[PDB]
Amino acid sequence: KPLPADKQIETGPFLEAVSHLPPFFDCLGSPVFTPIKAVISGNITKIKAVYDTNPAKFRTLQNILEVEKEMYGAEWPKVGATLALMWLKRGLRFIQVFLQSICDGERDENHPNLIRVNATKAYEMALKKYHGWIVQKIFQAALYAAPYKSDFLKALSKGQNVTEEECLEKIRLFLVNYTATIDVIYEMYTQMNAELNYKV
Amino acid sequence: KPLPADKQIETGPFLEAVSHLPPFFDCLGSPVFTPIKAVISGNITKIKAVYDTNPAKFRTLQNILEVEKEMYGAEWPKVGATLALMWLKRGLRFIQVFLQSICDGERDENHPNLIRVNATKAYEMALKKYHGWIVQKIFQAALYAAPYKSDFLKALSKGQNVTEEECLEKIRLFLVNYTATIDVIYEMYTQMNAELNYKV
Ligand SMILES: CCCCCCCCCCCCC/C=C/[C@@H](O)[C@H](CO[C@@H]1O[C@H](CO)[C@H](O)[C@H](OS(=O)(=O)O)[C@H]1O)NC(=O)CCCCCCCCCCC
Ligand SMILES: CCCCCCCCCCCCC/C=C/[C@@H](O)[C@H](CO[C@@H]1O[C@H](CO)[C@H](O)[C@H](OS(=O)(=O)O)[C@H]1O)NC(=O)CCCCCCCCCCC
Ligand SMILES: CCCCCCCCCCCCCCC
Ligand SMILES: CCCCCCCCCCCCCCC
């Protein structure tokens, strides 16, 4: 759904929406992506657990950061749902940049059947800042398991079997409100000084 | 707790016990192990979700396999809690073999400060059969992140700071009922023809 004019992101609906994302990792043709599915689902579960404690107090994502800042003092933002959402958003941004790169026709002219270049750009823009050497090396190894472009687009078409062109048009439309929402989440972290820059 | 004479493993208590395991992965000094934590926690969550549907019908692990065999016909055992426990047990066996290898004094004489040889033996005995090439390569990369032996033993001592010798004695005692329990789970899969041998 489009953002409301005030740009507040309702937590409940957000959680319902993002919970559709992990199952797509089971559509990528490689069990290599199972642990990624699980880590993202863990972030979502942690945010849901906090929300469920008091759905009014945590009605919006903005409320989560505001309330937790007040609740946790010196340990914040490296705590609670603020931390879980900090990581979740990085995964959401990876997906944004990846999909946008594919839709924008970016490709390796000698491997046009792969999506490695798109995944690498997304990784650099969303995650690499926060990863040490061994994690980067595992990402590089995992790229071998990334699906062929055609197979990837087939994972997104609801089985239906449309053309690549039709699939990409649907992704382009999806990206409008998706990108807008992720941008608001990033803005909130920035404006609240809630972003951390430690490496894993 | 020791096995009852009839060797039935009560599901509730089992779930309570195994839920202590994922947090140990956060004590290993490397965020590389977070996705492993998450995958194991996912197995546990899936078994708990089935159990919670009907705690009497699923009172024991044996009941889970028996009931699901009857519930799911041709799709079983690649379904439900049977599948989740099939994978969980492989992780439990890895931990068994790893700990036992350390306790038995197995080491690489030119890297006695590492636990790579112990992890490799555990991997070979518990998981490698079920992993294709890229997953094996990721395991090998991840070994770089494995803690030094001293640090690993410090993760198990409840903070306390005992000698390595004391830590290993405690692990040896732990392994008695742990190994017995995992052996019963493996036996159940074998006797029910519930084991699968597909690779990921
Ligand atoms: C052998 C086969 C298997 C396996 C593995 C293959 C792929 C592995 C990719 C390597 C990169 C991730 C490895 C490490 C991940 C995690 O360590 C980090 C931080 O994870 C966070 O850590 C926090 C504490 O600092 C809290 O515990 C968070 O927990 S919480 O409780 O606060 O919620 C937790 O998520 N998450 C990350 O780096 C985020 C990664 C997002 C990934 C987005 C999709 C990427 C798609 C890539 C396509 C190639
Ligand atoms: C960049 C930094 C990060 C990341 C990654 C580092 C380590 C990665 C290790 C690679 C091996 C695991 C990679 C793949 C894992 C998973 O694909 C498999 C099957 O996973 C199962 O799949 C089933 C469908 O077939 C169901 O979906 C199960 O879901 S369910 O819903 O049925 O419950 C699901 O668990 N589990 C496995 O292979 C089990 C692995 C157990 C591991 C035990 C501890 C190992 C300790 C090793 C010490 C070195
Ligand atoms: C190698 C990276 C894989 C990224 C997984 C993307 C899954 C989410 C895609 C959601 C887009 C839905 C568009 C509707 C057609
Ligand atoms: C590199 C493999 C790491 C294995 C993680 C083991 C965690 C579970 C250990 C439980 C043993 C508890 C003994 C009590 C002192």
Residue numbers in the entry:
A (entry chain A), B (entry chain A): 10 to 209
From the paper:
Human glycolipid transfer protein (hsGLTP) forms the prototypical GLTP fold and is characterized by a broad transfer selectivity for glycosphingolipids (GSLs). In human GLTP, a glycolipid headgroup recognition centre located on the protein surface enables selective binding of the GSL head and ceramide amide groups via multiple specific interactions. Encapsulation of lipid chains within the hydrophobic pocket involves a cleft-like gating mechanism that results in two glycolipid-binding modes. To elucidate the structural dynamics of the GLTP–GSL dimer and associated adaptations, we comparatively analyzed nine novel crystal structures of wild-type GLTP (wtGLTP) and the sulfatide-specific mutants D48V and A47D/D48V complexed with N-lauroyl-containing monosulfatide (N-lauroyl-3-O-sulfo-galactosylceramide; hereafter referred to as 12:0 monoSF) and disulfatide (N-lauroyl-3,6-di-O-sulfo-galactosylceramide; hereafter referred to as 12:0 diSF) in different crystal forms and compared them with previously studied GLTP–24:1 monoSF complexes.
The GLTP mutation D48V near the ‘portal entrance’ of the glycolipid binding site has recently been shown to enhance selectivity for sulfatides (SFs) containing a long acyl chain. Compared with wtGLTP dimers, all dimers of D48V mutant are locked. Compared with the wild-type protein, some interfacial regions in the D48V dimer contain noticeably expanded intermolecular contacts. The first region involves the α2–α2′ hydrophobic core formed by residues Pro44, Ala47 and Val48 with their counterparts, as was originally found in the D48V mutant complexed with 24:1 monoSF in the sphingosine-in binding mode. Since the same core becomes the major protein–protein′ contact in the D48V dimer complexed with 12:0 monoSF, we were surprised to discover the sphingosine chain projecting outwards and entering the partner hydrophobic pocket in the sphingosine-out binding mode. In turn, the lipid–lipid′ and the lipid–protein′ interactions become weaker in the dimer of the D48V mutant as indicated by the reduced number of interatomic close contacts, which are reminiscent of those encountered in the sphingosine-in binding mode of 24:1 monoSF complexed with the same mutant. Only ‘closed’ conformations characterized by a very narrow range of θ angles (62.6–65.5°) are observed in different complexes/crystals. The extra monomer–monomer interactions arising in the mutant and described in detail in the next section stabilize the closed conformation of D48V–SF dimers, which we therefore refer to as a ‘locked dimer’. The diminished monomer–monomer′ contact areas of the D48V–SF dimers imply reduced stabilities, which decrease despite the expanded protein–protein′ contacts (1300–1310 versus 1020–1090 Å2 in wtGLTP), again emphasizing the importance of the bound ligand for GLTP dimerization.
